Every structure is written in C-alpha cells, then in structure tokens.
Design a binder for these strands. Structure first.
Lengths: 149, 108, 118, 44
RNA sequence: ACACCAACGGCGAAAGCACUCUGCUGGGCCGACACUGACACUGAGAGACGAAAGCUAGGGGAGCGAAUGGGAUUAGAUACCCCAGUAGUCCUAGCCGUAAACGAUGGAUACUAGGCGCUGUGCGUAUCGACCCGUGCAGUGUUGUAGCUAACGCGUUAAGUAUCCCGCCUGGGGAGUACGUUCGCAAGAAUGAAACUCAAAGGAAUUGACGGGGGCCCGCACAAGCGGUGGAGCAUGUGGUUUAAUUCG
C-alpha cells in the first residue's frame, strides 16, 4: 500500500495545544472521552498544586526526557538477524514518549489516576520513576549494539 | 503418541476402530515421528473408509493427517490405499518428508 | 617511553573477520597495538566498522604521550575494517602523510584451500 | 584533510577482489570461465 | 606454483602446453615452376603416445589434503562447517592405458549465398615508412541463404550434395555382469554371453503445476498500534465415553 493521507491533528480542548490533545487521545480507553478528559485536567490541576510553573513546561520538559533518538529494530539480512539501530523520527518519539509514560503511569499504585499520572509525570520531570528508566533500558540496548551498522 | 509428544486426536468415519488400528496409528505415526524433537501442537488423524463391500466404488481406506505445528505453518496429507495399514504407512512417509522439509528449511 | 620521535608508521591488519591497529616506529619496535579483540567485545561483533573505529581510537589515543604529528599508515588485507579506520585516523586528524597498501599479492605461490560449499 | 576517500577510489585500479578471489580453492576453467567471462564482460 | 600480460587469443595428432634465457629437434603455412611424375586416401590385425587418480623403486615434502582424530550443527551425522592431519600432490626410472579422453560430430577429396571478426603470410594503392584500403590463400570464430533434420539446430571448419575407407549400432533390464582367455606387480583393463523378465526404455519440443530459481505487484499478509482467545467461571456446539436411545448430517 502506498501512504496515509497526510494528517489531521487538532489542539487541546482548553489550552490549544497539539501535544496535550494527543495525550488525551492516548489516555482514552474505549470511547469514554469525557472521563479521559477528566483524568487529564485533574492531572493538570494536580500539577498546579505540586509545583508552580506552566503545565506545558513540566509536560514538554517531561516528555523530552522520555523521547528516544534511536531504538532497536531487529532486522534481517540473508536470514541473519541483526539488532541494528535505526534513528526514530520526531513525532514517532512523541507517540512512544507518551506511550511509555502512560503505560508506566498505569503501574504506580495508591490513589486515583490523577495522582498516578501526576507522580509518574514528575518522575519523568526529574529523571526518576520508570518511564525514563524505560528510556534508558531501551536506549542502552541500541547503544550496546553499534557494531552492526 | 504415547508420551511427551504432540496431542493425538482420532476421527473414525464409517469405521469401527479397534486396538490394532489406533495402536498401529500411534506406533507408526507416533513412532515414526518419534525422532522429532518437535513441539508440534496438535495432530488430527482422520481415518475414514469407503467402498468395496461397504458401498458403491472400489475398496478404499483414506487417511488425512494434519499437524497444527508452531514450526512454520500447518500441514496435511491425504492418502487413499487398499488397506488401513497401507494408508497410514503411506501418510507416515509423506509427513516424514514434510517435517524434514520444515526442519531442513530451518538452516543457517 | 620510546625513542620520542613524532613520526611513525601505522599498520592496520584488516582481516576478513577482524582488525588490528598497530603503530610502530621506523625501525619496527611497536609502541602500541590495539585490535578489535583488545577493545572489549569479541565474537561475531569484532571485525565490523564500529570495531575498526573503536579499535583505532583506543589504539592511537594512547600515543598522546608522544603526540605524533607526522603519521603514515600502511594497511593490509581485505575486510570491512579499512574505511572506518581511515576515517578514525582522519578524525584524530594528525599529519597523515600517506596511506598505503602492503597486502600480500601472491604470484600463484601456494594452493588456497577448498571452496566452502556453504 | 577533508573526508574524501581516494584510497578506495584508487583501490579499484587493482582491486582487493584479487584477494576475495584467492581465499577459496584453485579451481579450473569452469569457474575461471564464470569469473573471467563475467570479468571479461564487466570491462566491455 | 608461476600474478598483471590472458584475447570470444597461438601451437600440438590427441592428452596437453604460459616466469625468462640458451641448446638440440618435430610439425605447419606462403612464393617461384627449381626438381620427380601419381609416388594418392584409408587402415583389419599391429605399434606408439595417452589428463587425473593408482602401483613398484628411490628422493623430497612448504601449501593443499582422501583416510583418520577432535570440535560444532543435528533426534542421529561415519557428511556439508571448523582445527589438526597421513598417503598423495613434485621429481628420477618404470608399470597401469582408463576419463563427460567432448566439437557428445572417424578420416580424405571435389562442389554449393552472404555479413561481421581474429591470426599468419602474398600482391597492388598510398606514401617511398610506420600506417591504411582492398584482395590471393591457409587456419580460427560469430550470425546466416539453399538444403538436410523428428525437432533443437548445422550451415564452406555442414549434421548439405556426392565418392572412397574403417569402426560401431538393431528394445530396456539382466550386464559391461557370469564363464573362458590375453595383458597387468596389484588395482583392474580388454574380448564378452545366456537363463529369465518387461511392453516399454528413450529424444526433441509444448501446455500446466511446482522450486528452500529470478524479476515485478497487490492483500489486516507481516510489520506499527489497539483489543482479545489460550488461564478462571459459565452458555453452547463437536469428538470420545456411557446408555435401551444418547436420531442423523
């Protein structure tokens, strides 16, 4: 098949941001869009309560520390499987960034999803927790095999 | 398939199955795919008979053996012979070539 | 130490599955050698252009006690380890006078062994 | 210096393909006609 | 053992022959009439040579490398892969006499379109000297008319048209085996059946299918996501088991 028709991406409902709307679509599970909306804006009203900066700043600065520049694509030549790394694009790194961020945010227990996404989000903002460690363990594997190409 | 092997499933159509029949099935099929080291999931051996003194047509014994293996696909072999025993030995030979096709194609 | 002269030959035994980056003076007393098996990883990984780059870098990074200006490189043999090694020496950028090949070009001397049939 | 490679470029004058030729066995005119027919037609 | 030179190139009867130089020596091709005057062709049996592997005798032994030995892959591996590695490979003197020893085409003469080539010489042009053009022949190659051929193709180097000479063939197995004999140090080579059995065995071409042969292009086919089944409980269907029947498909 050739290609996908280009893209249509709208901005955030109340902040007019194309990243946070991407994040509210990724936290969506089966159509409950008002509830995912609720979880994200309770996370923003939580992040105004924790520190006192723009949530765009702590969010974008968080996902800069989750986004990888390179990853493992276990490719094949002649039947021989090389673990050769290939440089991932930018918006691909956005989708992977909030991917690991969100799934890792679905592990830290204790309280509702606002506290869970808040806690793993500031752990991304401080280089701790699990999402940026997941960045490292997917980053120190492609670093480990640069002897391929 | 006495032990450790793929799961055996018989089908008997138009045929009252005996001890010597399914014993010959597990011993010829199972003991010829006993030098396997294959974790094949499921073997369906469907052993129907037809014709001759039973009905119109020549005397036929027709076996189909199907292997739902993990190892690169599914395979089936249908042979039609004058006896049950010649059917099951002949399908046993065919499935020997098909499994050596699978194992030998895993190379390098 | 050594004779302390900043000109000296570099030999790169680029094998079909390995590389060796040795460096020696004009007479031929080696001042350092470092190969793909030297720099850590070993096996099917060694003998790739990353191993040529890392083995050359860890080879000539230890001649900073000399600080050789006038470099000249005398490589040998077939393999995927040549061009990354020359990009490594030009990355260190020291006064590479001339690179050259000294590979054994036989004049039908000995019979090379059986073809592989794999 | 610049990142130009004239050793590879000059190398194909007398290629290192006389060393991938000489790893495997001395064999007669079947594979010397295959390699030297494909090589007599690669230069023409 | 002799890279580049190495060429769809040169020579030999074939096998073969390539680092250079020297010596002895074979054979080919071309011209002049310089000579003889049919001395010609083929060749049973015979004789010689005859790749490689093999064997006797003595040297020599770096690489490679049957057998062997170890490691690996593998259910297994006496094999492909890898590491060692003996005979052998080379030479002297012999024996052996077989090869897909193939151009899968015995030799010789005469005759029958061309195109594009290469090699060797000869004549004329051109210059006066290397070229360069046509050619006279001989040899080597590639497309190709006629004709032949079951077809593919061959086609002045015929598988064409004719003439001569020798060999060999008459269904496939059995079987290049048995027996005998000759040769051979042996390995074996040569000559070479039958009983019985089969209705085929073969050749060239076509159409399909297929290929762990290419080339190209689609498909939620894989990859990227998202969500499940397989785990638990239940609903239901099938197989098996049981029963008088667990209707049949």
């Amino acid at each position: 098949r050739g290609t996908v028709e280009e893209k249509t991406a709208k901005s955030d409902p109340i902040y007019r941001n194309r990243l946070v709307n991407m994040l509210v679509n990724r936290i969506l599970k089966h159509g409950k869009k008002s509830l995912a909306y609720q979880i994200l804006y309770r996370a923003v009203k939580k992040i105004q309560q924790k520190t006192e900066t723009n949530p765009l700043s702590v969010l974008r600065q968080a996902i800069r520390g989750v986004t990888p520049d390179i990853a493992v694509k276990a490719r094949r030549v002649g039947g021989s499987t090389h673990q050769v790394p290939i440089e991932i694009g930018s918006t691909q790194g956005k989708a992977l960034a909030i991917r690991w961020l969100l799934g890792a945010a679905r592990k830290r227990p204790g309280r509702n999803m606002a506290f869970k996404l808040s806690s793993e989000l500031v752990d991304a903002a401080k280089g701790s927790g699990d999402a940026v460690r997941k960045k490292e363990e997917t980053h120190r594997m492609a670093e480990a095999n640069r002897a391929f190409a | 398939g006495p032990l450790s092997s793929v799961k055996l499933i018989l089908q008997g159509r138009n045929l009252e199955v005996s001890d010597n029949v399914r014993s010959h099935v597990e011993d010829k099929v199972g003991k010829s795919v006993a030098k396997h080291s294959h974790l094949v999931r499921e073997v369906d051996v469907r052993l129907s008979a037809r014709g001759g003194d039973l009905s119109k047509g020549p005397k036929l014994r027709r076996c189909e053996v199907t292997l739902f293996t993990k190892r690169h696909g599914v395979i089936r072999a249908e042979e039609d012979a004058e006896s049950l025993y010649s059917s099951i030995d002949l399908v046993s030979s065919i499935i020997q070539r098909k499994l050596r096709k699978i194992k030998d194609k895993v190379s390098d | 130490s050594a004779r302390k002269i900043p000109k000296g030959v570099i030999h790169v035994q680029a094998s079909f599955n390995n590389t060796i980056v040795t460096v020696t003076d004009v007479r031929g007393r080696v001042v350092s050698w470092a190969s793909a098996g030297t720099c850590g990883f070993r096996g099917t990984k060694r003998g790739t252009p990353f191993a040529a780059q890392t083995a050359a870098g860890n080879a000539i990074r230890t001649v900073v006690e000399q600080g050789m200006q006038r470099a000249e490189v005398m490589i040998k043999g077939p393999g995927l380890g040549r061009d990354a090694a020359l990009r490594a020496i030009r990355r260190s950028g020291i006064l590479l006078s001339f690179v050259r090949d000294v590979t054994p070009m036989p004049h039908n001397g000995c019979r090379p062994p059986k073809k592989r049939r794999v | 210096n610049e990142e130009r490679l004239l050793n590879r470029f000059r190398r194909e004058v007398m290629r290192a393909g006389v060393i991938q030729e000489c790893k495997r066995r001395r064999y007669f005119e079947n594979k010397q006609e295959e390699k030297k027919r494909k090589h007599r037609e690669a230069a023409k």
